A paper describes a structure:
We crystallized GgUox in complex with its AZA inhibitor in two space groups (P212121 and C2221) and solved its structure at resolution values between 1.7 and 2.1 Å. Individual protomers are composed of a tandem of structurally similar tunneling-fold domains of mixed ɑ+β topology that form an antiparallel curved β-sheet with helices arranged on the convex side of the sheet. Dimerization engenders a basket-like structure that hosts two symmetric active sites contributed by residues from both chains. Recruitment of an additional dimer positioned upside-down on top of the first one and rotated by 90° generates the complete tetrameric assembly of D2 symmetry. Residues Y16*, P62*, D64*, F165, L176, and S229 further line the binding pocket with the aromatic side-chain of F165 engaged in π-stacking with the pyrimidine ring of the inhibitor. At different stages of the [name] reaction O2 and water must occupy the “peroxo hole” above the organic substrate in proximity to the Thr-Lys catalytic dyad (T63*-K18* in GgUox). Dioxygen interacts via H-bonds with the nearby T63* and its stabilization is likely also promoted by the conformation of the sauropsid-specific Y230 that lines the “peroxo hole” with the hydrophobic “side” of its phenolic side chain. In the X-ray structure of GgUox we observed that this residue (Y230) lines the “peroxo hole” and likely stabilizes PIU contributing to the equilibrium between this intermediate and HIU. Of the eighteen cysteine residues of GgUox, C287, positioned directly above Q231, is in closest proximity of the “peroxo hole” whilst C14* and C289 are further away at ∼8.5 Å from C287. However, in both space groups, intermolecular contacts are, at least partly, mediated by the loop containing the sauropsid-specific C98 residue, indicating that this interaction is also favored in solution.
Numbering used by the authors:
A (entry chain CCC): 4 to 301
B (entry chain DDD): 3 to 301
C (entry chain BBB): 1 to 300
D (entry chain AAA): 2 to 301
């Protein structure tokens, strides 16, 4: 074996979990954006791996310094714009960069309120689904922006079943038309190259679509015949209501809530006491894209 | 070569940990959930299972789990405090070999979903903005004592915080500061003693409100904190002033310092614009205050 | 709170009916034919709303039945005047159906005129002449008065002078010049109440009110009469009707105007001395006034 | 006997400018945005000297109303027709002390941006009337500024899951009971926000439209049985009130068209609900206004 028999399929490096708070003051009123940033590069050469020559390597320490400098100089209007600014900086500054990817997630600080009055400078951590984004670009290619929400845990106590599935000698699952639907969601969507809109406004709108499609209307809900169908309802709601979304990926990790058999304990459990099964757990995942966007890619 | 005769049993305790279940209640089409994690521990009047390999008096931890689930079905859960009381009372009445029972309960923070201000009949979202818990305990022929609390409560203010005039010595490099970020993860636990005649949910919400308001100060100007320790005291004194049911209050503040990154070498000036949190190592302070009247009554 | 129920909600109004019931009533006196072609709308409010609130139709009179009743009454009673026919329809509903809380009948005439050859009326031939559509309206609530209104709409009148608009309120957004000699062109909606009085010749009084509107609009035929605004012309019409027609208790007049602009033709190398005028159809001005006799208003 | 001003009461005086049509164009670089509207603004003045005395001193010309609408569109832009109607009413109330009352009605021209291969066109539009959006704002001196929004000329049809049975029977009722007809309705829907203006007008208008379509239709896989036009109106209103707390009062008018299964027996074939002929006149109407008890009590 020698270097000549071996092909480099991929080389990538970067700085992970760069944590900082960007503070902005309008007189007495304070605004915060706390983020965690990961920035990864692929270089046009691999001399650092193949030859022990570091000449082209931008230290990961420099990646961190650049992220902090851009936050200071530019501020953070949206994590998407900040991710774009970082990718653009790397592409326009370093000719040895073949590819840049920036991942950002928001720390979910909310302003405190007292009797409906917003506090000028006090905040509470409220994780109701983590906001993230991702920007990436190859040399001479498009800068593509994705946004998402993860660690989003939703549960409805009825309007859920799973019936009429494939049966075989190892299938013991009963048909059910009235279970708890409990899901941890990862949702990620692509804007492609479109960046003419309010990133915060569209992110909020997509989140609203996910919750409403999951839940159905507040007065009656909507029957889910499978986790898979609920994923589809979420994706089709987003695509129907948010033209900026070109491609949407949803992953639902479910937890079954078992109605505990209490016969042997001398009472009847009419869907009163339910025990969650956290492992093993089921998952389903789907990615839908607009035909017109995918054809335009070719 | 040591025998039972050379050795003293100082403590023996056992139990069931992380009993997880959802209690579902339906009022027509409107669904209500209480999902909890329960730990119930017992001390028995004897230690034959340890000393002699004799299990005659041991209540299986499996039976502890069965009892918790049966009581949830039969009684429901009006509040986790009432459920913890019901579990402790059940063990003390039912089993004469129980010397002591302690029940710890924490709520899974499900919130009802709203669409355009309309509450959803049966859909919920997980929102961990401080975990509600309680603890009930009782020794044979002693009082059943109930505590409630909130933990993993993370609060931050961006100003009205300093730490000055502290003790200096040859290993003290900390500068005096009058304008830092105050970021704290709070554990708060309070005792009601034996009083259980009031709305547990209403009082818990009121104590939480006092913690947030005392931490923050008024929304138009805030309030200067001269230390983490003083902020803990302000929280405790606010709760005791506004919530007569609270006899004893413990607060633990785990802080994170946010450093203003020196950017001189990167050719720019950072005027408290970019701050980097230090998560480890981290400072902690803890205080427990009690009402003199309640502590004297204990004697 | 997840949905509203009937308990959180007030029914402010529930009304239904049949609209644009079109028919011709033909009457023959030997060879001589008489026509009355009408368009009828009849609306009911019922004493309950179970059809809306509960999906229960037990008390609902089908709108198809409303149509049948209007056609049957036209056959049985004839149409002496649209007002008497509207009265007959309201009375039928109130006396027949205990579930009717309120009835309103609106009728308009199709404006057929008999053809004339050298002043001789044709026995059976007619021409459509829409020079102001005649209508009426009768309504009654259970245990209340049956009230009759008559009117004329789509009446378009124009005079070429004796019209101005001067001395109006001026402000930074007011560019309108003062004018003392413009075209006054108005499309009129006129509606008047007789209240409960129905002892007179409906056709005769309707014709008299129409005559008053035309004469008050126009002024005397040898000189006319100066109008200082659309609003003043509306008042002159209303005060003429009230002066000459005692049966009219309350009168509503709506004037939708069209301004005729004297085209500036300077750039086209000629002078337009109020010779060529271009109507502005949108946007358009409107004014509306309702006057009532103090005696009638006090009495109710 | 000639009547004088002393015998007569002025019950109502109102005037205004109707059908003010314009397009507001906004450019963000190459990308063009349009809002084309039709505005009517009406005033009641604190005096009626223009009618009673031929004195125009207090009259704001309708031409000035038009100028103000155009000036406000230029200065403010149009984020929503509701905000524009608010801006017009506020301008009149705060500018003219002789104004007792202002009402502004606005409807949108339904321009939609063109798309090619999923790509929105920077500056090209097509007219797509799928229900006309309108709003109405009004205010009396020292009274609340009240905003209403609506959709009209909205024509919806389902081909089954509709009947009308169990209705009141009488000697003039020939309508057969039916459990499987076409339900075809032209809807006028208007709702009041009262004084609440803390929400996104465009977002809530779209949400109310969605409620109307979904309540009319039922779920797309099975639909929902309608036992009357009246019950369908109620389902629409109760869906909107359940889902849209901002709606205080909702009025729905359903004008229906019956589709008759043509009897083709004499033409030698059987028509099994294959060929249906719409009856456009006469036509049935039903109308309901529901209000929240809390809002109506707060008014008194
Ligand atoms: O909705 C469901 N989808 C599945 O794929 C599945 N497998 N077990 N239960 C299930 N429920
Ligand atoms: O508020 C503070 N208390 C302390 O005890 C401390 N120690 N370092 N910084 C500190 N700040
Ligand atoms: O007679 C008129 N009345 C009005 O109110 C008006 N407004 N513009 N022109 C007008 N002329
Ligand atoms: O649904 C209906 N409502 C009515 O009131 C009616 N009248 N005729 N047909 C009708 N259908
Ligand atoms: Cl808060
Ligand atoms: Cl929510
Ligand atoms: Cl500092
Ligand atoms: Cl005290
Ligand atoms: Cl009723
Ligand atoms: Cl003729
Ligand atoms: Cl002129
Ligand atoms: Cl004439
Ligand atoms: Cl006269
Ligand atoms: Cl006056
Ligand atoms: Cl209101
Ligand atoms: Cl209500």
């Amino acid at each position: 074996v020698t270097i000549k028999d071996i092909e480099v399929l991929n080389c990538e490096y970067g700085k992970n979990t760069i944590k900082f708070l960007r503070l902005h003051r309008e007189g007495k009123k304070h605004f915060v954006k706390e983020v965690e940033v990961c920035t990864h590069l692929r270089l046009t050469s691999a001399h650092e791996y193949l030859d022990g020559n570091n000449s082209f390597v931008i230290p990961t320490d420099t990646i961190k310094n650049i992220v902090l400098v851009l936050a200071k100089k530019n501020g953070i209007s949206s994590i998407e714009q900040f991710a774009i600014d970082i990718c653009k900086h790397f592409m326009t500054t370093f000719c040895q960069v073949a590819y840049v990817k920036t991942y950002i997630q928001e720390v979910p600080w909310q302003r405190q309120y007292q009797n409906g009055v917003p506090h000028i400078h006090s905040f509470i951590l409220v994780p109701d689904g983590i906001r993230f984004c991702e920007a990436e670009q190859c040399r001479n290619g498009p800068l593509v922006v994705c946004a998402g929400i993860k660690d989003l845990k939703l549960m409805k106590t009825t309007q859920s079943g799973f019936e009429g599935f494939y049966r075989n000698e190892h299938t013991t699952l009963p048909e059910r038309n009235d279970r708890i639907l409990c899901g941890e969601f990862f949702c990620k969507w692509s804007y492609g190259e479109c960046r003419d809109f309010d990133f915060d406004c569209i992110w909020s709108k997509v989140r609203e679509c996910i919750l409403e499609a999951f839940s159905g209307p507040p007065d009656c809900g909507e029957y889910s015949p499978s986790y898979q169908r609920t994923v589809n309802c979420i994706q089709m709601c987003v695509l129907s209501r948010v033209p900026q979304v070109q491609v949407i990926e949803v992953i639902l990790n479910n937890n079954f809530y078992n109605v505990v058999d209490m016969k042997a304990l001398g009472c009847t459990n009419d869907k009163e006491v339910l025990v969650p099964v956290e492992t093993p757990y089921g998952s389903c995942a789907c990615t839908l894209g607009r035909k017109k966007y995918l054809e335009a890619q070719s």
